[PDB]
Design a protein around this ligand. Structure first.
Ligand SMILES: O/N=C/c1cccc[n+]1CCCCCCC[n+]1ccccc1/C=N/O
Ligand SMILES: O/N=C/c1cccc[n+]1CCCCCCC[n+]1ccccc1/C=N/O
Ligand SMILES: CC(=O)N[C@@H]1[C@@H](O)[C@H](O)[C@@H](CO)O[C@H]1O
Ligand SMILES: CC(=O)N[C@@H]1[C@@H](O)[C@H](O)[C@@H](CO)O[C@H]1O
Ligand SMILES: *[C@@H]1O[C@H](CO)[C@@H](O)[C@H](O)[C@H]1NC(C)=O
Ligand SMILES: *[C@@H]1O[C@H](CO)[C@@H](O)[C@H](O)[C@H]1NC(C)=O
Lengths: 532, 532
């Protein structure tokens, strides 16, 4: 049977799924680890005990325990990101979409979900791997990993809650793919890991970490890089937040062993309810439990690793969206709201700057304000709104990705950079938010090919073109087909720093993506904060 | 006789001078002070002893002792600024141009020469008052004052060299005008003091200083303001430079009395030869002997005076030129020269920044560089050249004048601001220097009306229009003729901050003159330097 596969862990039984009036196989909900419950909460993942008999892989698994967005109930815009299955701490599963008939050795892509390390599910409609698998004839995997305190509570020195275990969750899933994907027709020699947001930063983290490098071939990063200011913390800061979390739930705090035990007796929701109370500053685009610079997973600091060339050398394809910041300002910054144009007063603009750069002294805050204020027209509500959108996007996502890409290219074997700026015709969010964090994903997964979702024809064409770029890059290390008449996405080089737009218009090459602002975030401001 | 005038100091005999195929009277070389020679070197001026008989006022007087530009011998561009008479320490004289027939009570304008407080003469061709006097029917005075160490050597606490005596030279000349100009047909109630560069800053200084306010009615400032970073020093810094000057000439340094005596035995040229050796930094647009913040002439610091409204309240007309910096970079900055386009390398640009902001730490220098660098095109020789031109202009002249004008307007009785950007058709300096420091003066004094000087017709028209603005403002406090059909130079206000261009094209109003750069020089950078 095409739906029966014998792996090293035991036999799995999948299901036939319809896609664009054809069909393909899906193996959903395969475990790659022992359920991390009870005394194994906060702990490193263990490999899954092999099973006898046939594992039923016909339905999606549980989503990991996580915060649930309730700002706009019934609103698809926010709820498309929420878990669509029951939540459980028993959530370490992966899903596979396989072409029909079964391939022998074809290119593999493994997806890693975003969600600020505090949220995410492999099972969301926008992550459905069937269109990609079917259209490009690739084996599509989607993994899962613990988020929140469950994934990232860090008491360094203690082996009961070391930190980074959600990254090791990802690593164990890549190990399983390495080991077994051949039985599904995947080529273990040609695995591309890709991810958006925290998943993009995760991809970058596996590139850096020695323990992860050998388990994938190449990598795509969407709107995220490992050096993002929100993607990691020192061991001291992690310790502090873990202690404060215990302080919020009335734990004994005299020893690591006392704290951890107390935290293990709590029900999942008690941890989720107080999770946001541990942040050190009044901030946006900051998350409580994130990867920690521990000296095991990351041997030294991220910057010294990037300078010395201490990372996997291979091809990378990556980029950003036009308006990365709007999602975050909407939720947290005064003056912004979903159903108005959100024209921002000068007073709200400055409140905005404070929340967006929480770690900055007064001089730093002035430096930023000056850099994004048009002093000819300082009380223009639209210019204030958009400038603050640009600040949050540049600081959090674009300038950290640009620092990474410039550093990586010095040592790497080929870089391809994009700037995604198509505003989708059917977007439910308001005009002012622009091209939002996470809204390139639907084009990457081929949702525009489904007619009932109401995209234009040129949006279908864009989606196909992006899928073929992504898949051709996974297959060869180059998104272009050599010998074809279409426009050439040029290689990014240290010298010329070229990149393309991704949108419905004929492609354009440009150079030095937001260099004037990123010299400010990546060189000047940090120097200013170190002197003062 | 029309050429004989009886003043309070004694009788004066002038001369009839031809102008634009008519004639007028000129009283040249009238003394207003005792010659400041011998023991009176470095000292406050004394009033001139009245004379019996008739003072011959038919020829220009001596120019004060000063440094003489020799960079381009025979080149009119540089030599038009040099002294055209014999130099002497016996130089305290003034000159008067009077319409024919003699007026009774008409508007008076008294000119104060620039030259960085280290140079200047009342007697230069470009300062010839006859065209202005004749064309607008005003009595035109031009004064003189000691420059260099002779005018500004400052040993505070000592009455032998107190500092600021060159400003008191100006004050005594304004006193003489107050007292006597009526006998020449001038209205002592309607005196306008005007000046360029150090003379513009001087004008501003008489507005601030209590001792000077009552001696003039209103004021014009061209490319200079009292708060310019080069226009004054602390008493400690003045003391240091006076000591270092004495150290350069082998003086006994054990007491003020010893130093001053030693300096008084030296010939003028010995002081001039070592004058530049006392500057604290490697710099441009900085001068050795300048006004000192002494607590007598200036009661408190310039900034506290500007904040509290401690100054004469009256009308002011003022402005700047497009390319104020080029003159200074030519003379002192590596990569610039008179006979090339002076395209500047990135390395020379940074050398430039260091010399232009000599008092800044490394963080400050970076802040400036970032602000004036296009990071898309950082090795564009023209953009580097022009950016450095703009830095020197903005820091030295434009942003300090803009801070002054904004502060003054809060308390003042009417402000009129211009931006002069006509590149003269007959200019001998190269294209790259643009609209240079000091090249609006020729339009103010009417040289374009003389055919043999080879200006265009529209340049004649511009000159006349500027002269009539200047003269109508001196007469009424408003450069416009109410009830006339010509375009209206609008009042500058705290709210709307309006200003005009001065050039051959139809006038345009704009707002907030170089506000984006001047917020940087006047707010951010000083705050950055105070924290670090
Ligand atoms: O961090 N990445 C999140 C993500 C990534 C891809 C797609 C969708 N998202 C949902 C994030 C939008 C809303 C941000 C919500 C942050 N937040 C959560 C809980 C409580 C408060 C807040 C923010 N307060 O300002
Ligand atoms: O300060 N204002 C001077 C002025 C004003 C109106 C018209 C003409 N000028 C001549 C100044 C140009 C050249 C600057 C010369 C400065 N300088 C003098 C002596 C020795 C060295 C230097 C400069 N070295 O970099
Ligand atoms: C047990 C088995 O072989 N296949 C099951 C099927 O019976 C069931 O309807 C479905 C929903 O849980 O999952 C699959
Ligand atoms: C002395 C007198 O009354 N007038 C003199 C005149 O004789 C002389 O030619 C000229 C040049 O110095 O200056 C005037
Ligand atoms: C990648 O590496 C191969 C083999 O080592 C080399 O020949 C090629 O030039 C490299 N490509 C780039 C873009 O560096
Ligand atoms: C100047 O002062 C006069 C008289 O005090 C006043 O009436 C007039 O409004 C003032 N003008 C300005 C521009 O402030």
């Amino acid at each position: 049977s095409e739906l029966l596969v014998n792996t090293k862990s035991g036999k799995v039984m999948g299901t036939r799924v319809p896609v664009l009036s054809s069909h393909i196989s899906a193996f959903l909900g395969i475990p790659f680890a022992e359920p991390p419950v009870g005394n194994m909460r906060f702990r490193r993942p263990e490999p899954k005990k092999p099973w006898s008999g046939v594992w039923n892989a016909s339905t999606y698994p549980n989503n990991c325990q996580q915060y649930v967005d309730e700002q706009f109930p019934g609103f698809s815009g926010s709820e498309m990101w929420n878990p669509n299955r029951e939540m459980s701490e028993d959530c370490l599963y992966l899903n596979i979409w396989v072409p029909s008939p079964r391939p022998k050795s074809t290119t593999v892509m493994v997806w890693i979900y975003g969600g600020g390390f505090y949220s995410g599910s492999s099972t969301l409609d926008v992550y459905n791997g069937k269109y990609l698998a079917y259209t490009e004839e690739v084996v599509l995997v989607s993994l899962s990993y613990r988020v929140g305190a469950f994934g990232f509570l860090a008491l360094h020195g203690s082996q009961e809650a070391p930190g980074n275990v959600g990254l090791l969750d990802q690593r164990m899933a890549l190990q399983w793919v390495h080991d077994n994907i051949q039985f599904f027709g995947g080529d273990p020699k040609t695995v591309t890991i890709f991810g958006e947001s925290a998943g993009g930063a995760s991809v970058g983290m596996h590139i850096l970490s020695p323990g992860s490098r050998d388990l994938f071939r190449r990598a795509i990063l969407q709107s995220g890089s490992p050096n993002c200011p929100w993607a990691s913390v020192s061991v001291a800061e992690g310790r502090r937040r873990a202690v404060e979390l215990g302080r919020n739930l009335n734990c004994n705090l005299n020893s690591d062993e006392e704290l951890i035990h107390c935290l293990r007796e709590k029900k999942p929701q008690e941890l989720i309810d107080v999770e946001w109370n541990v942040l050190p500053f009044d901030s946006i685009f900051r998350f409580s439990f994130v990867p920690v610079i521990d000296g095991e997973f990351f041997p030294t600091s991220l910057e010294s690793m990037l300078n010395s060339g201490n990372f996997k050398k291979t091809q990378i394809l990556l980029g950003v969206n036009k308006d990365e910041g709007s999602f975050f300002l909407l939720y947290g910054a005064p003056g912004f709201s979903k159903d108005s144009e959100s024209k921002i007063s000068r007073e709200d603009f400055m409140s905005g700057v404070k929340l967006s750069v929480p770690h900055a002294n007064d001089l730093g805050l002035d430096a930023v304000t000056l850099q994004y204020t048009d002093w000819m027209d300082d009380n223009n509500g639209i210019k204030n709104r958009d400038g603050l959108d640009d600040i949050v996007g540049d600081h959090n996502v674009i300038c950290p990705l640009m620092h990474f890409v410039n550093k990586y290219t010095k040592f790497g074997n080929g870089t391809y950079l994009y700037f995604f700026n198509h505003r989708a015709s059917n977007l439910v969010w308001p005009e002012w938010m622009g091209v939002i964090h996470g809204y390139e994903i639907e084009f990457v997964f081929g949702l525009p090919l489904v007619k009932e979702l109401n995209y234009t024809a040129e949006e279908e064409a864009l989606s196909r073109r992006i899928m073929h770029y992504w898949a051709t890059f996974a297959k060869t290390g180059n998104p272009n087909e050599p010998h074809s008449q279409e426009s050439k996405w040029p290689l990014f080089t240290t010298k010329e720093q070229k990149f393309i737009d991704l949108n419905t218009e004929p492609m354009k090459v440009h150079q030095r993506l937001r260099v004037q602002m990123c010299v400010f975030w990546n060189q000047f401001l940090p120097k200013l904060l170190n002197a003062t």
